[model samples]
Target chain A: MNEFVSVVADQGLATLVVSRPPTNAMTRQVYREIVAAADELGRRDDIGAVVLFGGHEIFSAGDDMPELRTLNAPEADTAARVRLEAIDAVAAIPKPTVAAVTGYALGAGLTLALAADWRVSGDNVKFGATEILAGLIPGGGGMGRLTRVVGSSRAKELVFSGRFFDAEEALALGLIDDMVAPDDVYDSAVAWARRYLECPPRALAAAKAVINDVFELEATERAAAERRRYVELFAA
Target chain B: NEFVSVVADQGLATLVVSRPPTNAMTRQVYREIVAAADELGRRDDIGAVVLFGGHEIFSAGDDMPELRTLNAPEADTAARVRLEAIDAVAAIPKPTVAAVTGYALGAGLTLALAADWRVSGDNVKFGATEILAGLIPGGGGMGRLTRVVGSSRAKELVFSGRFFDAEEALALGLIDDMVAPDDVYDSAVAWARRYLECPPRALAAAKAVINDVFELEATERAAAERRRYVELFAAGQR
Candidate 1:
């Protein structure tokens, strides 16, 4: 329905293209379309997975801070929260989700990608959280989500500096799922997503759900809890 | 016998973990780590920390045969204690680095990951082999590895209980550097020394912000950053 997003569904994949000129500065409308795109793909049975991308060079730059200057603090806060919430919802979708990033994925752009199940980046992709440099905390829960993956010291270093990381550094930081050639980002992500679809979708869904639930347990209890679930599968 | 030994050189404190034969860790060893970290954290003499094991292998994970002797309650207590040790090292205000040589598998690898940085030989083997014994990684291993390698890759390793060389580890982002076995210790010390040039309070503030997220309010983070400035310029003391 919006001009900011163009959804191209082929076979079992839903590749949502997000484009804005130059750096692909994600606007308020862009957020709405992203949320809509994920939900729309989710409602259809034919679509097995979702892939969010932004052309061959740029994924998304960030939000319009000037737009924030126009609104009240609460309003700005709500917009950021809504975007993060929409991302969280999209991530919680039953099927796998992939973020095919290239060029730059910064600030809200990076946070949105993190919400996906896996983030596959072009070799040229630069990942960053530039919010702290802008004299504000990360509005989209970037630091919190990052802490979960990279531990404390690494997360603090990035959030504190807002430094841009290359594909190798991002891969080393566990920030991205995989890195492929610039032109292969979309095809690779789609190809990876298709592998999930190849498995029994129901089994995959159950395993993912179990993982999402049990991964919450600290390491000590996690294995035991995971083992008990397996025992349930063949109680006889 | 001492399960852990601490040797201090200048501002660097090296805690060498050791046990005979396979170098398998027991609950008492976990307590040794907890005690060592608490002692080291309280000392002003130490500016940085290094963890290493002087042998062919860093550690061989928990003593499973011994763990089987304990009932569920004791095993649970030991697991939590092990986690406390890892968490303590991770929460150390000063920078900590791990030096690895040969095999660093299961909890040994987990302990190494707790450091702010890890340096290992390219040929050293590492794995989360707990899953092989019908167990999964304990002492925050799963979470830390997941953070180090993401869910899918971490899941594959834990699910398979596979061992990978340091080259694979470097490619996977598990270790910070790949050096010759002899360079592991020296490299870690040099890495820690690089961080020592900055003010302690500043590094401490930076370390704290990411460790405990619940306390991270916007103003507090800003204040935390500025507090370091005052220590650097206005104040003479660390």
Candidate 2:
């Protein structure tokens, strides 16, 4: 029902298509809607996996910069909290999730991809964290996610340099699980979802719980460090 | 008694850390390793070097029991000397591989990190275990580990002094490849053979440039450093 998310339910999976179009930039409203949709999907017993994808040309271009520029301090703080909450909602959902990426997945978009258990990207797709270019650290869990995907050194190189990498480099860095032809990304993700569907749901959830608890603690600690560094920069 | 043993066979030099039991690095071991590596760096006959440890133990970091005996000045001097040995290993002109079969912890981890590539066995446990002992990793582990694994993950390992198995180490980019404990030595030697197939001058230049890129700021100074490497390679070719 949300304008940002077009959810379609199949036999054992749900595809949450991000459809804000052109860049699909994240606004406060879009994040709120995504949170609601993820909450709804999380409660479904029939769904074994959730496949997240976007429109033809772009995954999502991250935050709406012009909208972000107009927010007051309190509003900015609220916005950050909201975005983080949405990310947590996606990550906490009780099923496997796959990101089917095509075109460019940048900034906040890349953060969303990182939250998924597996990522399948088109061969020609570009992925990056472009927050540094905008003179702001990616506050919406990008730092922690990128660090886990690529090692800390390479993650810092990509973030500090604000560089874009193709699918091959992404694979080498362990950022994505597989590369697909442009037309096959969605199908590949769907196939991956079916593999999850064959497993016992309770066992899958238990495994997810163990892995997430171990890694998320590390992620939270790093995120706190990033926040400290961000505040230091602000005071400077 | 711990000693650095060298065996040269068919153009390959194997540097084995033969310290008994847990290969704790004494000041004498450091001095010997530095001298051996320095000599190896000058040899034109050796095509590659395989650095490994003897028996089940790879290394157990610095010799902490001995270190605890030293005065402040003596401790500082010992630490500096040990680090110089690690630098010499890293600066070896030929390609170097670390065949990690067992425990490679703390300063030993630093030594492993200095090699061009690491072929680790599944049984090996790797970590920067200094913070657990209430001390920082003094042997360039902080800089090189951060460079290899990234700052965020490196901080987690170092700050918590967590020991990770080889599978987790591979996932974390702490090493490049992994194998069964029995195959580690052969796999590392095979990797060295492949490395030797590349143009030696090009390989050296590439390593120098990558080290510069990781450690230096991208200033005019960094550019000059890169340019100097390019010139050095060109002169060698001529």
Candidate 3:
């Protein structure tokens, strides 16, 4: 129902775009809509892979500060807790995902970008952990994802300092995957998504599911899951 | 103490395996490793740990002669103890990295896999060579290897029990970083030092959440991480 977030598919590749004028600041309602869009994409047979984009002017200016300023500690914490669903939903998409970024991915925006399996960005884009400057932290499952990719020390630095970094440093830190001209960000992401066009959906889905679920399983469970998934592929 | 020692300095705990000449593990050596790991976890001065088996060798797995003497019942007991020793290293609350040089074969390789990350010498040789002995990697190697390299690749290595060097190991995700033999220890120490200045409570929480992530459901894990992160703010305020 919300106009801020929508999904558009070309052929089999789907792009989930967040388009709210200038900076595309995210409100609570916007987060819920993202969850809805992601859930829909996950169930759609026509969509083979997804790209998360926020236009060429800006990725996102992050959280809507006016809304955040009005919330108390308990309310802020509740909002943080609820926003996790948005991140989890993006990550839960069965197909491959890449976040296409241009100008900025700060605070909650950076968290959203981190949720995707990969990130494609413009060389001139800016990234930051703006939550610290606001006297808070990234609690929307982003901290964990960031820690996993770049290690605890670097994650802590970003969360504590509230500083911004450019695309080159972001690449070096393992935050973003590839860089192109600002105008080419979305197209490059589409190219990445289209590579799976010839892949068998069930096989790719199983591979992604097994790899995602492998870490959390115990020895007996992991081996069992691996065996079952392997055998099931033959029938598929 | 004779076979393993824990030296603490500059916010790092170096767990040294000193068995020299292959550095093969005996039951006593395994026990010492467990003790050393526990002490490092308990101490305040140590912010990180490095598992090393000196300059020439990481380890040659279990002492072959001792293993040949064990009956089925005795082997069961030894296997359980060995698993516990490796588990102790994995359970360390702080960050840990294995500094590997020379050979890290069979059980020795399993021990290195138990760490959070591994730094290997450029000339080191690694293998899951248990199949040659008509056995398998019984000491938590299968699961760890499977986690790192996926099940299919792990199957190939375990079935063939073939030796692979550092280059192939790096390409296959067996080790995180590779350096010259003389630089393995220093490189690993440098990696461990990354966390030396980080907030201890927050760093531990981060490590716990990432390590235990697979054990908890998505919502539950996120909730736990949120609580710990929120608590840090409250702690600072008071």
Candidate 4:
């Protein structure tokens, strides 16, 4: 639905709200809408930073697991491919992106937050890799993104434990950039967006490139092994 | 303890680990050294620690014959405990200086790394030779070694378990300074005296922050921690 993404633009910033009701589960349709919104924001020369938030209480409940449960094998494969492409699109956006999360952000939702340049969460928000509990490995680059953020040891603890964390622990671990009051989360994220927007776009993007590329080479072989382990879970 | 003894003099704590002929770390000796370091850390009057060994040897690493008998879980637990002791030494709030004379190999070399600074004699022969025993250095060797000498050099050292003399150790950033064998003790004490000039709490916080930063993400948490530290300093805690 067109309502899946609601965009608001100002002089130098754009706010994209992901608004699927209830869980705000990221379906193929929602991913398409988010991708399109990000592309539109990227093309706007006046827009310097994009702030992404979710409606109601959740940033997202991760990938639409109910949808996943119903899909046939071929359909599941197709969904995974498209979801990854959407994730890449978000990650490759020219402007800096910040995710303002007030509540639950798990699985693919967690991956989407990781794709952003920054994330701000409220004290009540819960974050974790819940896919393991669902008899799945995180599909939308969650493992790779988590490893990049937290390093191998901490990543293993979070992923393997599949335990939920509140904002304080997340803040301590450097998972989120900051933790604010629920009401202040969006405003704080917008403030971050405004600060990021002050930088020259091309230079900022170049610096981001350097930052991104630094760890790009560190973990691919390890990730490949993780992927194989994930696929083997299906056989078992 | 056959291998090490603890002594306190003039508010400085000393842990002397030595075994005759060769200071090979037997299971019992390793356990004793770890307990001794823990005990030294708890002393309220101890302003600093000087970790050294007796004449002709610092350590020769874990006893190979003993190591061959350890099952997987036994080896893992022992390795973990050993590493924990090394980490404890590194994490100790007070400044520590390792005074080395003669050989320091494998876990022994890693133990030296845990100190804030090292004063080594020209006779010191340092190596991480765990690889020769068909095992890797399990006592925080990889992590500490990597932090000191970037990743590439860490790989070269750990992968080959190559030995280096005092001069080479100084050149590689492994040891802070080299001294004559007779001067090692005096040099370590002098270094510890200089450390005593700083405010104690400030020094501890500074050490904690630097260590914590290495493990933290580049996020607002780090910023907040830094802010708290700056505030503490401004309040004249420094």
Of 2 and 4, the candidate ranking higher by DockQ? 2
Interface RMSD of each: 7.4, 15.6, 10.8, 16.2
Candidate 1 lDDT at A107 equals 88
Could you give candidate 2's per-residue lDDT for residues B92-162 as a string of tens digits? 87899999878999889989888888999988998877655545565556667755554335544654577
Q: Model 4 RMSD to the real structure?
A: 18.4
Tens-digit lDDT string for candidate 3 (B133-228): 545564566667766765435544654567999999999898999999999999999999998887777777787777666555678888989987
| Model 1 fnat value | 0.03
**Per-residue CA lDDT of candidate 1, range B127-147, in tens?**
888756656577767667765
Candidate number with greatest DockQ: 1
What residue runs in model 3 are displaced by over 4 Å at the alpha carbon?
A72-78, A214-224, B1-238
- List the per-model TM-score of the A chain: 0.86, 0.89, 0.93, 0.87
* Model 4: per-residue Cα lDDT at residue A152: 90
Residue pairs with backbone overlap in model 4: none
TM-score of model 4 (CA atoms): 0.50
lDDT of each: 0.76, 0.77, 0.81, 0.75
Model 2: per-residue Cα lDDT over A1-236, one tens digit each: 49888677898899988888688888888888889888988888778789998955678888878898999999989999989888878877767888889898888988988777778899998988898888988867889878865668998999998889999999888788889899899899899777667654543443344334434434334323322322222222
Tell me the docking grade of candidate 3: incorrect
Structure candidate 1, residue pairs in collision = A149-B147
- Superior by lDDT: candidate 3 or candidate 4: 3
Minimum summed lDDT over a 10-residue window in model 4 chain A is located at A226-235
* DockQ (CA atoms), all models: 0.07, 0.03, 0.03, 0.02
lDDT score, residue B72, model 4? Answer: 58
